[PDB]
Ligand binder design. Sequence first.
Ligand SMILES: [Zn+2]
Lengths: 56, 112, 123, 44
Amino acid sequence: AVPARRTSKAKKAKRRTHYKLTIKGLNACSNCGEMKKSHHVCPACGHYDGKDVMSK
Amino acid sequence: QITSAKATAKTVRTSPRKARLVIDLIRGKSVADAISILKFTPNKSAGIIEKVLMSAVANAENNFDLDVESLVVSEAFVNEGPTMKRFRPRAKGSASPINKRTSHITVVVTEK
Amino acid sequence: RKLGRTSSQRKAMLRDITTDLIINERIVTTEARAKEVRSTVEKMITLGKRGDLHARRQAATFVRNEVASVREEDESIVVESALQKLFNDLGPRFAERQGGYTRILKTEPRRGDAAPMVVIEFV
Amino acid sequence: MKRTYQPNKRKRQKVHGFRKRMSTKNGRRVLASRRRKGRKVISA
RNA sequence: UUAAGUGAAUAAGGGCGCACGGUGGAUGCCUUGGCACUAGGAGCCGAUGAAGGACGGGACUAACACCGAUAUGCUUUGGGG
RNA sequence: UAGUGAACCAGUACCGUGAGGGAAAGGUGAAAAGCACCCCGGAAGGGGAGUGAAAUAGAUCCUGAAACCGUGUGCCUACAA
RNA sequence: GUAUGAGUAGCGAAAGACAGGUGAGAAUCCUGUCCACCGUAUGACUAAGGUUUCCUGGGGAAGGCUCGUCCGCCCAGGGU
Ligand SMILES: [Zn+2]
């Protein structure tokens, strides 16, 4: 219908418990040790175990 | 000398709800953790808090301290900047309020 | 099966993309486009091995009709027309290679609409 | 749909023009009553 | 070692307190401006073109104010230095 | 928010074809002395170094209350209407 | 002046894809190819109406229901 009252000050946080941000899956390079994503091309190295992948 | 340089970002054209999420994920970590986490974010804070940390590092170098790699983000803030107020015509000829917001953001960098 | 759009627009899109990986062999797109182009080019290489008059006359569906790629001459303008490039390279590149001709990478999300991106190359 | 406030250059100058508040004695009320308000735009 | 019983503490979050910050201008204080009057002056301007304005006049020109092709001004008499 | 509607370039901006309806908006410093130069960043924004008695007096600029939103900590909380 | 509902509703009919450019940064900017939509009309000319939005060269705080290196937006000149 209509919100019967204002949501009191407890329930703002007690809702927003499950509103976190998560970043996961970060690992060092094979060439510079920078904490980059598993199963992902390094933006600075550009390698899958010793390959000039991003190269011309 | 004295430790704990600081740097402030002012009039940041976003919300606080969309910024306090990101600075759940920084407080308690070192500098090498910090830029590493911030490079892989799908959000607006990436362009912001990174340059805040870079200025914090340059203020730790050029003015106060040494040992750049042994610095810890102790605390940080996102605070409610001055808003901006404009309107949009809702249907049936009447009006409706729609906000725009800013924020003021600070980050505290102690040594250890 | 997969879905991105309506019925005939998928056939439109797969004729659209897949004239590159015939010319460039590098394409920067998303997840689902990459996997559909996997399946289609895994098909349409194998019909570049036969050389039959069924191969010339089924290549005219998943290939756009006339697309130039001209970097050669002797004293001419020789137009490697993205189907002659099939029947003059891809057989004689994959004479002994069995299935699985391509590779998919996982680089980056997108600045605009959070699209995770993929490079596709062959060998 | 038709709506109301439609423009011309003859009509809104031969209804609210300067002469046709001079040619009577009930626009002369309006002239002095607006000049005793300080408003610049008298009429067309 | 068995058996019967007694069992403390760790918080994704939250409450109460303290302390520090932001967004907001209530209040303190001040006036260049108003309100009501006192005491005098003064109580019409106009076909010799009015009350009001339009347009224009500067080195730089968007506005205010002053002015009118003699246009951000002409001449004379007194104060002035 | 008093005081004319109007202490500020107001019967203006603005609403109404019309006649007419008509708003909010004063305060750095004693003197702009209004932050040369260094550094981050494309910039904005900043941190030093300076000015200044004082900058939490830095041009949204005197003191700055409430509502609102952040930070960290002393004590409490998962068998409870 | 500030919450609440709440980062919920909605983002106001319609097919795009790749490569290459300038740029701090691109799904939206530019350039090239192919595909597609309308075709008594989303093509051409004018009378009102609008009152400079037109062109040239720059900028990105505002505006644009996203960004925006672009604009009918702004700054400066120039045109009837
Ligand atoms: Zn690497």
